[PDB]
Amino acid sequence: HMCDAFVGTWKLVSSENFDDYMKEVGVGFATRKVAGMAKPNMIISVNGDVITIKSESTFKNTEISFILGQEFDEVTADDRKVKSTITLDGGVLVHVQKWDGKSTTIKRKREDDKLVVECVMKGVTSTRVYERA
Numbered sequence: 001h002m003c004d005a006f007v008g009t010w011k012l013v014s015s016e017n018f019d020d021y022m023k024e025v026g027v028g029f030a031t032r033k034v035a036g037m038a039k040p041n042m043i044i045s046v047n048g049d050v051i052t053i054k055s056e057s058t059f060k061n062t063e064i065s066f067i068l069g070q071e072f073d074e075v076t077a078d079d080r081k082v083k084s085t086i087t088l089d090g091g092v093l094v095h096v097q098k099w100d101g102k103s104t105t106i107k108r109k110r111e112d113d114k115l116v117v118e119c120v121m122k123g124v125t126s127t128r129v130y131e132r133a
């Protein structure tokens with residue numbers, strides 16, 4: 001019953017500062033432009049201890065499945081090959097991605113009827129808000 005409030009199908013409704021976040025990550029011009037247009041649907045489900053987060057968009061489709069606290073390999077939408085670990089901290093899903101001596105953290109939380117995603121790379125934050133589809 002851990003992540004019950006996250007489960008469902010969600011659609012992106014707003015984004016702030018995502019271009020600056022992508023720049024800080026190292027994403028190149030053309031990928032930033034295309035990725036920045038996309039309005040992904042995020043599909044979250046749970047089966048036993050395994051959480052699956054799918055992103056379906058016009059830019060890229062991705063899917064990760066994981067157990068909390070247990071590191072996994074992830075290929076991101078912008079084609080980084082990262083090592084990821086996702087934990088639950090006070091009701092917030094905290095997703096750390098490590099690659100090439102770099103790190104970024106993506107936090108997902110329920111706020112009212114929204115699912116709010118905060119993406120941080122060094123001093124740069126982007127906030128992405130999803131609503132139920």
Ligand SMILES: C=CCn1c(S)nnc1OCc1ccccc1
Pocket residue numbers: 022025027035040076077078106117119128
């Ligand atoms: C980090 C946020 C996770 N997310 C959301 S929210 N929409 N798309 C996402 O994929 C990650 C990404 C896309 C493009 C460039 C770098 C990273």
